[PDB]
mmCIF file of all heavy atoms in Angstrom:
data_model
loop_
_atom_site.group_PDB
_atom_site.id
_atom_site.type_symbol
_atom_site.label_atom_id
_atom_site.label_comp_id
_atom_site.label_asym_id
_atom_site.label_seq_id
_atom_site.Cartn_x
_atom_site.Cartn_y
_atom_site.Cartn_z
ATOM 1 N N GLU C 72 43.915 -170.357 13.692
ATOM 2 C CA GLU C 72 43.781 -170.485 12.276
ATOM 3 C C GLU C 72 43.778 -169.094 11.656
ATOM 4 O O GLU C 72 44.451 -168.853 10.581
ATOM 5 C CB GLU C 72 42.550 -171.303 11.883
ATOM 6 C CG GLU C 72 42.635 -172.754 12.028
ATOM 7 C CD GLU C 72 41.382 -173.549 11.603
ATOM 8 O OE1 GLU C 72 40.303 -172.931 11.562
ATOM 9 O OE2 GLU C 72 41.510 -174.743 11.318
ATOM 10 N N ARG C 73 43.051 -168.190 12.226
ATOM 11 C CA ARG C 73 43.019 -166.803 11.721
ATOM 12 C C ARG C 73 44.363 -166.061 11.758
ATOM 13 O O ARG C 73 44.751 -165.368 10.825
ATOM 14 C CB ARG C 73 41.960 -165.968 12.441
ATOM 15 C CG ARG C 73 40.557 -166.208 11.877
ATOM 16 C CD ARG C 73 39.525 -165.696 12.865
ATOM 17 N NE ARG C 73 39.413 -164.177 12.873
ATOM 18 C CZ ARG C 73 38.526 -163.541 12.122
ATOM 19 N NH1 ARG C 73 37.634 -164.202 11.404
ATOM 20 N NH2 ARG C 73 38.506 -162.183 12.205
ATOM 21 N N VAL C 74 45.157 -166.259 12.834
ATOM 22 C CA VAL C 74 46.470 -165.700 13.027
ATOM 23 C C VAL C 74 47.384 -166.373 12.064
ATOM 24 O O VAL C 74 48.329 -165.621 11.491
ATOM 25 C CB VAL C 74 46.996 -165.840 14.521
ATOM 26 C CG1 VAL C 74 48.387 -165.088 14.614
ATOM 27 C CG2 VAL C 74 46.077 -165.209 15.473
ATOM 28 N N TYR C 75 47.338 -167.670 11.866
ATOM 29 C CA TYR C 75 48.192 -168.398 10.951
ATOM 30 C C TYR C 75 47.969 -168.025 9.563
ATOM 31 O O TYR C 75 48.903 -167.906 8.766
ATOM 32 C CB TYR C 75 47.936 -169.949 11.152
ATOM 33 C CG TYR C 75 48.930 -170.776 10.310
ATOM 34 C CD1 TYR C 75 50.191 -171.188 10.785
ATOM 35 C CD2 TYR C 75 48.520 -171.131 9.031
ATOM 36 C CE1 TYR C 75 50.981 -171.981 9.891
ATOM 37 C CE2 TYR C 75 49.378 -171.933 8.224
ATOM 38 C CZ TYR C 75 50.579 -172.269 8.680
ATOM 39 O OH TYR C 75 51.352 -173.067 7.880
ATOM 40 N N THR C 76 46.693 -167.829 9.134
ATOM 41 C CA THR C 76 46.366 -167.498 7.793
ATOM 42 C C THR C 76 46.843 -166.008 7.539
ATOM 43 O O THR C 76 47.322 -165.737 6.387
ATOM 44 C CB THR C 76 44.819 -167.584 7.490
ATOM 45 O OG1 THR C 76 44.350 -168.850 7.986
ATOM 46 C CG2 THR C 76 44.448 -167.490 6.010
ATOM 47 N N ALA C 77 46.661 -165.185 8.533
ATOM 48 C CA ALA C 77 47.095 -163.792 8.385
ATOM 49 C C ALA C 77 48.604 -163.669 8.094
ATOM 50 O O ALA C 77 48.952 -163.069 7.128
ATOM 51 C CB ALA C 77 46.711 -163.025 9.642
ATOM 52 N N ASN C 78 49.386 -164.359 8.835
ATOM 53 C CA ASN C 78 50.816 -164.445 8.668
ATOM 54 C C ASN C 78 51.163 -165.140 7.278
ATOM 55 O O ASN C 78 51.993 -164.552 6.614
ATOM 56 C CB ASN C 78 51.367 -165.390 9.801
ATOM 57 C CG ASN C 78 52.928 -165.491 9.639
ATOM 58 O OD1 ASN C 78 53.608 -164.461 9.838
ATOM 59 N ND2 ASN C 78 53.382 -166.712 9.360
ATOM 60 N N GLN C 79 50.421 -166.130 6.898
ATOM 61 C CA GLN C 79 50.651 -166.866 5.643
ATOM 62 C C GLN C 79 50.347 -165.861 4.425
ATOM 63 O O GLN C 79 51.095 -165.905 3.486
ATOM 64 C CB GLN C 79 49.713 -168.040 5.569
ATOM 65 C CG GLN C 79 50.063 -169.055 4.413
ATOM 66 C CD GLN C 79 51.502 -169.700 4.570
ATOM 67 O OE1 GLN C 79 52.095 -170.060 3.590
ATOM 68 N NE2 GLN C 79 52.046 -169.737 5.844
ATOM 69 N N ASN C 80 49.318 -165.128 4.580
ATOM 70 C CA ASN C 80 48.964 -164.109 3.542
ATOM 71 C C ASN C 80 50.110 -163.040 3.410
ATOM 72 O O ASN C 80 50.410 -162.625 2.235
ATOM 73 C CB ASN C 80 47.647 -163.325 3.793
ATOM 74 C CG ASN C 80 46.468 -164.307 3.969
ATOM 75 O OD1 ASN C 80 46.544 -165.459 3.466
ATOM 76 N ND2 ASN C 80 45.422 -163.889 4.507
ATOM 77 N N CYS C 81 50.657 -162.589 4.444
ATOM 78 C CA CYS C 81 51.829 -161.719 4.486
ATOM 79 C C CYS C 81 53.041 -162.369 3.940
ATOM 80 O O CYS C 81 53.806 -161.758 3.164
ATOM 81 C CB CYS C 81 52.083 -161.180 5.865
ATOM 82 S SG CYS C 81 50.780 -160.080 6.553
ATOM 83 N N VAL C 82 53.347 -163.636 4.278
ATOM 84 C CA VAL C 82 54.490 -164.459 3.853
ATOM 85 C C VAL C 82 54.356 -164.678 2.420
ATOM 86 O O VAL C 82 55.476 -164.725 1.709
ATOM 87 C CB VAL C 82 54.530 -165.728 4.745
ATOM 88 C CG1 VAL C 82 55.417 -166.757 3.967
ATOM 89 C CG2 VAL C 82 55.230 -165.395 6.018
ATOM 90 N N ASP C 83 53.281 -164.950 1.818
ATOM 91 C CA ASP C 83 53.057 -165.162 0.481
ATOM 92 C C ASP C 83 53.456 -163.928 -0.373
ATOM 93 O O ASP C 83 53.866 -164.022 -1.493
ATOM 94 C CB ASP C 83 51.541 -165.475 0.080
ATOM 95 C CG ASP C 83 51.195 -166.907 0.723
ATOM 96 O OD1 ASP C 83 52.071 -167.614 1.148
ATOM 97 O OD2 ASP C 83 50.002 -167.153 0.609
ATOM 98 N N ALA C 84 53.196 -162.774 0.221
ATOM 99 C CA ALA C 84 53.396 -161.504 -0.494
ATOM 100 C C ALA C 84 54.828 -160.974 -0.446
ATOM 101 O O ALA C 84 55.322 -160.259 -1.230
ATOM 102 C CB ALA C 84 52.438 -160.453 0.159
ATOM 103 N N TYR C 85 55.530 -161.372 0.634
ATOM 104 C CA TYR C 85 56.830 -160.803 1.003
ATOM 105 C C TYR C 85 58.009 -160.846 -0.053
ATOM 106 O O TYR C 85 58.631 -159.824 -0.261
ATOM 107 C CB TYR C 85 57.317 -161.349 2.317
ATOM 108 C CG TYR C 85 58.545 -160.601 2.927
ATOM 109 C CD1 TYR C 85 58.512 -159.283 3.299
ATOM 110 C CD2 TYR C 85 59.743 -161.370 3.053
ATOM 111 C CE1 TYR C 85 59.678 -158.625 3.778
ATOM 112 C CE2 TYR C 85 60.905 -160.665 3.572
ATOM 113 C CZ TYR C 85 60.900 -159.401 3.904
ATOM 114 O OH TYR C 85 62.025 -158.763 4.459
ATOM 115 N N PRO C 86 58.191 -162.034 -0.668
ATOM 116 C CA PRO C 86 59.257 -162.048 -1.700
ATOM 117 C C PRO C 86 58.952 -161.125 -2.836
ATOM 118 O O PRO C 86 59.871 -160.574 -3.420
ATOM 119 C CB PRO C 86 59.199 -163.520 -2.162
ATOM 120 C CG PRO C 86 58.391 -164.311 -1.109
ATOM 121 C CD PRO C 86 57.440 -163.299 -0.590
ATOM 122 N N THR C 87 57.674 -160.970 -3.236
ATOM 123 C CA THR C 87 57.278 -160.001 -4.274
ATOM 124 C C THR C 87 57.591 -158.610 -3.870
ATOM 125 O O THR C 87 58.055 -157.802 -4.659
ATOM 126 C CB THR C 87 55.758 -160.182 -4.695
ATOM 127 O OG1 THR C 87 55.589 -161.492 -5.277
ATOM 128 C CG2 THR C 87 55.376 -159.178 -5.719
ATOM 129 N N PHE C 88 57.350 -158.301 -2.561
ATOM 130 C CA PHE C 88 57.679 -156.967 -2.029
ATOM 131 C C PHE C 88 59.141 -156.668 -2.070
ATOM 132 O O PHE C 88 59.447 -155.602 -2.539
ATOM 133 C CB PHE C 88 57.174 -156.934 -0.512
ATOM 134 C CG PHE C 88 57.588 -155.720 0.227
ATOM 135 C CD1 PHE C 88 57.351 -154.389 -0.202
ATOM 136 C CD2 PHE C 88 58.490 -155.750 1.329
ATOM 137 C CE1 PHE C 88 57.783 -153.292 0.376
ATOM 138 C CE2 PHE C 88 58.870 -154.654 2.014
ATOM 139 C CZ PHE C 88 58.604 -153.427 1.587
ATOM 140 N N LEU C 89 60.021 -157.578 -1.585
ATOM 141 C CA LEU C 89 61.489 -157.307 -1.635
ATOM 142 C C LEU C 89 61.957 -157.145 -3.036
ATOM 143 O O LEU C 89 62.773 -156.338 -3.364
ATOM 144 C CB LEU C 89 62.223 -158.491 -0.967
ATOM 145 C CG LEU C 89 62.159 -158.650 0.540
ATOM 146 C CD1 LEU C 89 63.182 -159.683 1.007
ATOM 147 C CD2 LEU C 89 62.472 -157.335 1.277
ATOM 148 N N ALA C 90 61.524 -157.962 -4.009
ATOM 149 C CA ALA C 90 61.825 -157.960 -5.420
ATOM 150 C C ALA C 90 61.550 -156.564 -5.978
ATOM 151 O O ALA C 90 62.436 -155.962 -6.512
ATOM 152 C CB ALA C 90 61.127 -159.022 -6.262
ATOM 153 N N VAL C 91 60.329 -156.076 -5.799
ATOM 154 C CA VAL C 91 59.944 -154.715 -6.317
ATOM 155 C C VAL C 91 60.617 -153.577 -5.595
ATOM 156 O O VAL C 91 60.821 -152.476 -6.163
ATOM 157 C CB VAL C 91 58.502 -154.545 -6.555
ATOM 158 C CG1 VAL C 91 57.938 -155.410 -7.561
ATOM 159 C CG2 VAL C 91 57.718 -154.661 -5.166
ATOM 160 N N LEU C 92 60.894 -153.700 -4.289
ATOM 161 C CA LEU C 92 61.444 -152.694 -3.476
ATOM 162 C C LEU C 92 62.942 -152.466 -3.870
ATOM 163 O O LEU C 92 63.281 -151.258 -4.262
ATOM 164 C CB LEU C 92 61.436 -153.146 -1.984
ATOM 165 C CG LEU C 92 62.280 -152.292 -0.833
ATOM 166 C CD1 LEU C 92 61.592 -150.911 -0.697
ATOM 167 C CD2 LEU C 92 62.353 -153.061 0.403
ATOM 168 N N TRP C 93 63.694 -153.479 -4.007
ATOM 169 C CA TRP C 93 65.107 -153.380 -4.506
ATOM 170 C C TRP C 93 65.263 -153.019 -5.951
ATOM 171 O O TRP C 93 66.064 -152.171 -6.297
ATOM 172 C CB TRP C 93 65.865 -154.668 -4.120
ATOM 173 C CG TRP C 93 66.194 -154.724 -2.615
ATOM 174 C CD1 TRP C 93 65.333 -155.268 -1.633
ATOM 175 C CD2 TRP C 93 67.343 -154.223 -1.924
ATOM 176 N NE1 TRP C 93 65.962 -155.146 -0.387
ATOM 177 C CE2 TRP C 93 67.179 -154.486 -0.591
ATOM 178 C CE3 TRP C 93 68.412 -153.548 -2.305
ATOM 179 C CZ2 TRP C 93 68.129 -154.124 0.398
ATOM 180 C CZ3 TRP C 93 69.433 -153.243 -1.366
ATOM 181 C CH2 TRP C 93 69.225 -153.440 -0.057
ATOM 182 N N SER C 94 64.410 -153.576 -6.869
ATOM 183 C CA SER C 94 64.408 -153.186 -8.193
ATOM 184 C C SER C 94 64.197 -151.689 -8.383
ATOM 185 O O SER C 94 64.909 -150.971 -9.034
ATOM 186 C CB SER C 94 63.302 -153.936 -9.010
ATOM 187 O OG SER C 94 63.592 -155.372 -8.929
ATOM 188 N N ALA C 95 63.076 -151.180 -7.847
ATOM 189 C CA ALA C 95 62.890 -149.718 -7.749
ATOM 190 C C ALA C 95 63.969 -148.924 -7.049
ATOM 191 O O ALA C 95 64.299 -147.843 -7.572
ATOM 192 C CB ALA C 95 61.537 -149.444 -7.007
ATOM 193 N N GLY C 96 64.533 -149.458 -6.010
ATOM 194 C CA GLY C 96 65.570 -148.711 -5.304
ATOM 195 C C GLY C 96 66.814 -148.632 -5.940
ATOM 196 O O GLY C 96 67.607 -147.642 -5.922
ATOM 197 N N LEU C 97 67.237 -149.724 -6.734
ATOM 198 C CA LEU C 97 68.507 -149.804 -7.424
ATOM 199 C C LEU C 97 68.464 -149.234 -8.837
ATOM 200 O O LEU C 97 69.372 -148.711 -9.346
ATOM 201 C CB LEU C 97 69.016 -151.223 -7.374
ATOM 202 C CG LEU C 97 69.367 -151.777 -5.999
ATOM 203 C CD1 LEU C 97 69.659 -153.287 -6.094
ATOM 204 C CD2 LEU C 97 70.484 -151.068 -5.419
ATOM 205 N N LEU C 98 67.232 -149.443 -9.528
ATOM 206 C CA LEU C 98 67.135 -149.041 -10.945
ATOM 207 C C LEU C 98 66.544 -147.675 -11.180
ATOM 208 O O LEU C 98 66.861 -147.079 -12.237
ATOM 209 C CB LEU C 98 66.338 -150.142 -11.713
ATOM 210 C CG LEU C 98 66.966 -151.574 -11.779
ATOM 211 C CD1 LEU C 98 65.866 -152.561 -12.042
ATOM 212 C CD2 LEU C 98 68.093 -151.723 -12.664
ATOM 213 N N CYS C 99 65.727 -147.186 -10.199
ATOM 214 C CA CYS C 99 65.108 -145.883 -10.363
ATOM 215 C C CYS C 99 65.650 -144.827 -9.437
ATOM 216 O O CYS C 99 66.600 -144.159 -9.791
ATOM 217 C CB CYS C 99 63.526 -146.026 -10.192
ATOM 218 S SG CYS C 99 62.567 -144.513 -10.596
ATOM 219 N N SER C 100 65.130 -144.771 -8.222
ATOM 220 C CA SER C 100 65.659 -143.812 -7.187
ATOM 221 C C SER C 100 65.428 -144.434 -5.819
ATOM 222 O O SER C 100 64.339 -144.861 -5.467
ATOM 223 C CB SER C 100 64.891 -142.469 -7.348
ATOM 224 O OG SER C 100 65.561 -141.463 -6.581
ATOM 225 N N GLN C 101 66.493 -144.290 -4.942
ATOM 226 C CA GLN C 101 66.425 -144.929 -3.645
ATOM 227 C C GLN C 101 65.436 -144.400 -2.655
ATOM 228 O O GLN C 101 64.579 -145.132 -2.162
ATOM 229 C CB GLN C 101 67.878 -144.910 -2.978
ATOM 230 C CG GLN C 101 67.873 -145.743 -1.699
ATOM 231 C CD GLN C 101 69.175 -145.583 -0.942
ATOM 232 O OE1 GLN C 101 69.540 -146.375 -0.059
ATOM 233 N NE2 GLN C 101 69.995 -144.530 -1.266
ATOM 234 N N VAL C 102 65.412 -143.103 -2.472
ATOM 235 C CA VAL C 102 64.549 -142.416 -1.431
ATOM 236 C C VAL C 102 63.022 -142.743 -1.535
ATOM 237 O O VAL C 102 62.438 -143.183 -0.609
ATOM 238 C CB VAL C 102 64.747 -140.917 -1.315
ATOM 239 C CG1 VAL C 102 63.929 -140.179 -0.326
ATOM 240 C CG2 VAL C 102 66.284 -140.632 -1.052
ATOM 241 N N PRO C 103 62.450 -142.563 -2.690
ATOM 242 C CA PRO C 103 60.998 -142.769 -2.900
ATOM 243 C C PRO C 103 60.637 -144.271 -2.731
ATOM 244 O O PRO C 103 59.607 -144.619 -2.186
ATOM 245 C CB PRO C 103 60.610 -142.216 -4.258
ATOM 246 C CG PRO C 103 61.780 -141.408 -4.707
ATOM 247 C CD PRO C 103 62.965 -141.993 -4.039
ATOM 248 N N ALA C 104 61.502 -145.137 -3.268
ATOM 249 C CA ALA C 104 61.372 -146.592 -3.138
ATOM 250 C C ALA C 104 61.280 -147.024 -1.689
ATOM 251 O O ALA C 104 60.350 -147.677 -1.278
ATOM 252 C CB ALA C 104 62.436 -147.247 -3.907
ATOM 253 N N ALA C 105 62.283 -146.590 -0.905
ATOM 254 C CA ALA C 105 62.373 -146.913 0.552
ATOM 255 C C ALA C 105 61.152 -146.330 1.297
ATOM 256 O O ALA C 105 60.631 -146.995 2.171
ATOM 257 C CB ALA C 105 63.611 -146.349 1.124
ATOM 258 N N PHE C 106 60.758 -145.040 0.914
ATOM 259 C CA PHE C 106 59.566 -144.498 1.428
ATOM 260 C C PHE C 106 58.343 -145.221 1.174
ATOM 261 O O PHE C 106 57.486 -145.496 2.051
ATOM 262 C CB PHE C 106 59.471 -143.008 0.955
ATOM 263 C CG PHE C 106 58.200 -142.273 1.440
ATOM 264 C CD1 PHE C 106 58.053 -141.994 2.748
ATOM 265 C CD2 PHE C 106 57.259 -141.835 0.519
ATOM 266 C CE1 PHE C 106 56.960 -141.289 3.226
ATOM 267 C CE2 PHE C 106 56.151 -141.276 0.979
ATOM 268 C CZ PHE C 106 56.000 -140.928 2.297
ATOM 269 N N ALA C 107 58.162 -145.718 -0.101
ATOM 270 C CA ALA C 107 57.077 -146.575 -0.467
ATOM 271 C C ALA C 107 57.104 -147.863 0.249
ATOM 272 O O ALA C 107 56.071 -148.370 0.692
ATOM 273 C CB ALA C 107 57.044 -146.694 -2.006
ATOM 274 N N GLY C 108 58.352 -148.448 0.354
ATOM 275 C CA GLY C 108 58.502 -149.671 1.153
ATOM 276 C C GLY C 108 58.071 -149.519 2.589
ATOM 277 O O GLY C 108 57.541 -150.448 3.131
ATOM 278 N N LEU C 109 58.390 -148.360 3.153
ATOM 279 C CA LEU C 109 58.056 -148.037 4.570
ATOM 280 C C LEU C 109 56.501 -147.921 4.781
ATOM 281 O O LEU C 109 55.975 -148.271 5.802
ATOM 282 C CB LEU C 109 58.725 -146.849 5.026
ATOM 283 C CG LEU C 109 58.944 -146.598 6.585
ATOM 284 C CD1 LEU C 109 60.032 -147.617 7.102
ATOM 285 C CD2 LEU C 109 59.235 -145.265 6.887
#
Side-chain angles (χ1 to χ4, degrees):
Chain C
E72 284 180 339
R73 280 166 74 95
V74 184
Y75 183 90
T76 313
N78 184 65
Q79 195 62 206
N80 302 344
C81 292
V82 157
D83 293 350
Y85 188 64
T87 296
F88 170 62
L89 288 191
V91 295
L92 171 69
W93 286 88
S94 300
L97 296 170
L98 300 160
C99 191
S100 193
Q101 188 188 195
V102 179
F106 178 65
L109 205 73

